[PDB]
Design a protein around this nucleic acid. Structure first.
Ligand SMILES: [K+]
Ligand SMILES: [K+]
Ligand SMILES: [Mg+2]
Ligand SMILES: [Mg+2]
Ligand SMILES: [Mg+2]
Lengths: 187, 129, 150, 68, 82, 202
RNA sequence: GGAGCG
């Protein structure tokens, strides 16, 4: 039944790491009374490790879009329970989204704006900094040719994200390929 | 009304540069303005510029370094084939040794020297030197 | 500046950068849309529905809570008026000036403003016909305008 | 302040405070909500808790309001 | 400036304003070249200084004072002066 | 406790009302003003005034020949300080009215080619400041809140009106120039008395 | 010498 917590696209076989994440997810469903009720409906569809720095790993778990709103209500508590099981790792939930390529020249086919690459990358960035809310964005175009984005986070949720700023920057570059640094505006 | 956001951006920079300012704000922002700045940046005519997201159109703050003599648009955006680039440079640029005309081609926004290398024509956006 | 004067005022609303609802706003999207339909059936227009929500319910922006603008919500429930609200108010003003002008033939100031209001009606009606928010043959008629509004 | 004695990207929090709401580096409203039952600071409706005016609604001395 | 061989072909290289980066021409008699002396641990002039050139344009605008103040606030932190 | 060289000078400048500015502030002097009081008077930031004095002194010591420095004042209150400033620092003082053509007319007897020019008030010394801009002559000037900054390279934010303010400013500047030459011992004290710089009415 | 293209 631990494989009923994973629905990989195309009914593909979960890898050796997804089963560990799924198996760890099943345990919290029954062991933790607080999360008993909520975790029943929730399920994931992928999971991967990303190296951050200093032999540190980050568990990036993708979630069905329809369930992206249910995880938020139990995001703060669930991450605490999964991080202890996955010692020395940070858990990040990102809803799955499709990126439809722009139509060719003179094509009648339409494309919803949410399926655009820019709209998806911005949406991934918002799901990456949960529970922190973005309050500003800056993009600096360096003379050499590279560009770096600076994201301002609400200082209210600073205790739950101050230690993850390195994981956010590393996780976002692999999913988007863009440099990002997070900062808290003075208040 | 606002007709050419590129003209406002380049006119603001040119006025700021003559007054000896170090920074200048461009509003509104557009991907044409950003790509025009990148061409200037690659040739060392401006420093670092930063795009501010305001959920409407954005704003750009450009660092100036005192190397920019003039920058302006050409309106309307005339068509320029590869063979007619020479005539435009003889008209808009101080000499045959420096200064760039920015074109919008099907291969992207680029200066006239890159357009000759790729042998692609297009339309004139502006110039700077 | 202004379409029909030399005014250069800039006063307007300034939307905040935070598009999400505040943490203290507990009302859910289904509840908000239930109230929007409830007010529309009472005759209120989209402009004065949002004012009540902001002033009496703490809903600064309906789109932040429901994800859709008020007019779109009404259309989905078949409550959008046949004539758009803004065009409706211009016609009502033109009717008022004409009614005043019939008793005041020498009020040349009103005659001047009536021309501006009606030309504003025709520019807006043209736009709505292009976007198919009005019947293709819809036409503003001073003789029968007063029957439409009021 | 002279143009070169100021940074356009990091203006002082006091300078942006007194700038017009639309002329700040990022537009921000000057209004807000408060408890007393939320009330808009610039309410156009008669709540008699608040009396609408040309700007902020005139609140009543009796009740105490908490900004949120 | 330089011929195809490499020889210089300019009479001279005009100075550039330290604040605006403008060239200073031979008739710009409102331009001034300033020297700020360097001190030692005790605080005595050591014969070393930093040079600043200002064009007549910036001095006529009245912005020389603020331009000099900023240029010195940065330079002194680089050469150890304080 | 012992007061540093800066705290002592700032204490001395407070007693002389060097921080009291005019009711109007020039837009190029706002960077030196600290705050405006309900009286309408601006208060000059004495911390920045001391820093500009140090910068001015660094420029003065770099002059190999002190006779190339010319310090002058048009108002009577500063005619005494400039004479004493030139006495100890070796500069060339010109008290009173400036003769037009001094820096430009090479054939008149009073012709001079200074390497540096020190002034007490840009508003009252507008003639030498205007004329210095025809001979590549940098200028140092004590500038009040309502002083024009045109053609002023180093502006020292201070009260250049009161008789005590003018005397103290030149006393401190003269001490700094000598201390940077090694002629006198470091510290906020000087064997010379400041009252020698104050205006002596008839 | 200063001012003005004069
Ligand atoms: K208004
Ligand atoms: K003559
Ligand atoms: Mg306007
Ligand atoms: Mg018109
Ligand atoms: Mg003559």
């Amino acid at each position: 039944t631990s494989k009923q917590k994973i629905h990989k696209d195309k009914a593909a076989e979960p890898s050796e790491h997804e089963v560990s994440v799924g198996q760890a997810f099943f345990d919290l469903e029954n062991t933790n009374q607080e999360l008993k009720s909520e975790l029943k409906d929730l399920y994931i569809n992928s999971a991967t490790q990303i190296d951050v720095s200093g032999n540190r790993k980050a568990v990036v778990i993708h979630v069905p879009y329809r369930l992206r709103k249910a995880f938020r209500k139990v995001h703060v508590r669930l991450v605490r329970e999964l991080e202890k099981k996955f010692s020395g790792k940070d858990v990040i939930f990102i809803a799955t989204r499709r990126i439809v390529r722009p139509p060719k020249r003179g094509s009648a086919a339409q494309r919803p704006r949410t399926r655009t690459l820019t709209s998806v990358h911005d949406a991934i960035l918002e799901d990456l900094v949960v529970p922190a809310e973005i309050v500003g964005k800056r993009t600096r175009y360096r003379v050499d040719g590279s560009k770096i984005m600076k994201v301002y986070l609400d200082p209210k949720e600073r205790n739950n994200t101050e230690y993850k700023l390195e994981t956010f920057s590393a996780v976002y570059r692999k999913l988007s390929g863009k440099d990002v640094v997070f900062e808290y505006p003075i208040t | 009304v606002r007709v050419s956001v590129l003209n406002d951006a380049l006119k603001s920079m040119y006025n700021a540069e003559k007054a000896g300012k170090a920074q200048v704000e461009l509003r509104p922002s557009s991907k044409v303005i950003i790509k025009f700045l990148i061409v200037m940046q690659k040739h060392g005519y401006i420093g670092d510029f930063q795009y501010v997201d305001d959920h409407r159109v954005g704003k750009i703050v450009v660092e100036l370094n005192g190397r920019l003599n003039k920058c302006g648009v050409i309106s309307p955006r005339f068509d320029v084939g590869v063979a007619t680039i020479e005539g435009w440079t003889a008209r808009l640029l101080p000499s045959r040794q420096f200064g760039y005309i920015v074109l919008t081609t099907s291969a992207g926004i680029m200066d006239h020297e890159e357009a000759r290398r790729k042998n692609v024509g297009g339309k004139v956006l502006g110039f700077f030197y | 500046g202004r379409m029909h004067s030399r005014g250069k005022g800039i006063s307007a609303s300034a939307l905040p950068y935070k598009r999400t609802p505040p943490s203290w706003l507990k009302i859910s999207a289904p509840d908000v849309e239930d109230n929007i339909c409830k007010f529309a059936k009472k005759g209120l227009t989209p402009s004065q529905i949002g004012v009540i929500l902001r002033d009496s319910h703490g809903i600064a922006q309906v789109k932040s809570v429901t994800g859709s603008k008020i007019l779109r919500i009404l259309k989905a429930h078949g409550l959008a008026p046949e004539i758009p609200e803004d065009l409706y108010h211009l016609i009502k003003k033109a009717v008022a000036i004409r009614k005043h002008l019939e008793r005041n033939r020498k009020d040349k100031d009103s005659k001047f403003r009536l021309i501006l209001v009606e030309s504003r009606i025709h520019r807006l009606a043209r736009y709505y016909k292009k976007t198919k928010k009005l019947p293709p043959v819809w036409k503003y008629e001073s003789t029968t305008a007063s029957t439409l509004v009021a | 302040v002279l143009p070169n004695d100021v940074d356009l990207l990091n203006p002082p929090a006091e300078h942006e405070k007194k700038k017009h709401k639309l002329k700040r580096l990022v537009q921000s409203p000057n209004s807000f909500f408060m408890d007393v039952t939320t009330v808009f600071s610039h309410s156009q409706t008669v709540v008699v808790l608040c009396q609408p005016t040309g700007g902020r609604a005139r609140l009543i001395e009796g009740c105490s309001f908490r900004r949120k | 400036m330089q011929n195809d061989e490499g020889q210089n072909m300019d009479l001279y290289i005009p100075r550039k304003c330290s604040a605006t980066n403008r060239l200073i021409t031979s008739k710009d008699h409102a331009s001034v070249q300033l020297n700020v002396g360097h001190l030692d641990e005790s605080g005595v002039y050591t014969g070393q200084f930093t040079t600043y050139a200002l064009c007549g344009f910036i001095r006529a605008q009245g912005d020389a004072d603020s331009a000099m103040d900023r240029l010195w606030q940065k330079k002194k932190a680089e050469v150890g002066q304080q | 406790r012992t007061l540093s060289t800066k705290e002592a000078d700032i204490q001395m400048m407070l007693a002389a009302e060097v921080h009291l500015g005019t009711k109007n502030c020039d837009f190029q002097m706002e960077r030196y003003a600290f705050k405006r009081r309900n009286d309408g008077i601006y208060i000059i930031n004495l911390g920045k005034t001391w820093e500009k004095l140090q910068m001015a002194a660094r420029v003065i010591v770099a002059i190999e020949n002190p006779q190339d420095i010319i310090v002058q004042s048009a108002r009577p209150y500063g005619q005494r300080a400039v004479l004493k400033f030139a006495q100890y620092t070796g500069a060339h003082a010109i008290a009173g009215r400036h003769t037009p053509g001094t820096f430009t007319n090479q054939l008149q007897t009073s012709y001079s080619e200074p390497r540096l020019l020190i002034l007490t008030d840009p508003r009252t010394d507008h003639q030498p400041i205007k004329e210095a801009a025809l001979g590549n002559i940098p200028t140092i000037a004590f500038c009040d809140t309502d002083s024009p900054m045109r053609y002023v390279d180093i502006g020292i934010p201070a009260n250049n009106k009161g008789k005590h303010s003018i005397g103290v400013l030149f006393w401190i500047l003269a001490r700094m120039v000598l201390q940077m030459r090694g002629a006198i011992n470091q510290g906020p004290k000087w064997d010379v008395m400041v009252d020698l710089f104050f205006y002596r009415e008839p």
